[PDB]
């Protein structure tokens, strides 16, 4: 159970003075690596998805991580999530667009995400039946507030999340040897999704 399982150094990372806006931009959304329907704003700190019907649209972070601890806060208003809002990571090979509404992040071998609307985990996931996260809720869905932390531990090869400062356990394992970028996939017209890189 939960925080007993945090990556090494996570408390320290979070307690330190946060990266300045320069560091946040360098690790933020990549205008050169996002859906053609997404506009990156403030040099990486957030993106806005154009109101294009029958489209799911993703973005990757500018920086891919293969070693060490990496955590960033995602801020995504609850009224701007729509039918499919997924938060996680992707390799460089994961698709960033499809032409219908779907859980695009985690629907293939190149991406891993949490459906913050339904509480399910998607990796290589096509049909119904994806697992619930976090565990230990007796099957009860945990609602995800506006802000959540995404925590990638490339020393252990895990991805996990935190709400309200509380780490919810590893969601995915077996990530070592890969180069992984912050990622989301979104369907809501004019949604604004913010990324705040915290280290390391």
């Amino acid at each position: 159970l939960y925080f007993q399982s945090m990556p090494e150094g996570l408390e320290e990372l979070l307690s330190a003075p946060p990266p300045d806006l320069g560091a946040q931009r360098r690790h933020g959304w990549n205008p050169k690596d996002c859906s053609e329907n997404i506009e990156v704003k403030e040099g990486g700190l957030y993106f806005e998805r154009r109101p294009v019907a029958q489209s799911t649209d993703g973005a990757r972070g500018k920086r891919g991580y293969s070693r060490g601890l990496h955590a960033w806060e995602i801020s995504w208003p609850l009224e701007q999530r729509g039918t499919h809002a997924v938060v996680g990571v992707a390799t460089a090979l994961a698709p960033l667009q499809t032409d219908h509404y779907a859980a695009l992040l985690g629907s293939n071998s190149e991406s891993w995400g949490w459906d913050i609307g339904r509480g399910k985990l998607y990796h290589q996931s096509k049909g119904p039946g994806a697992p619930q996260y976090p565990a230990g809720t007796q099957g009860e869905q945990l609602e995800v507030p506006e802000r959540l932390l995404v925590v990638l531990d490339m020393e252990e090869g895990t991805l996990g999340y935190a709400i309200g400062g509380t780490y919810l356990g590893p969601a995915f394992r077996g990530l070592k040897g890969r180069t992984l970028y912050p990622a989301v996939s979104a369907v809501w017209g004019q949604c604004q999704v913010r990324i705040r890189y915290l280290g390391e």
Binding site: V52, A53, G82, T83, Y101, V187, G189, Q190
Partner: peptide, 7 residues
Amino acid sequence: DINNNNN
């Protein structure tokens, strides 16, 4: 539409 998109 359902996702605040213009059809």
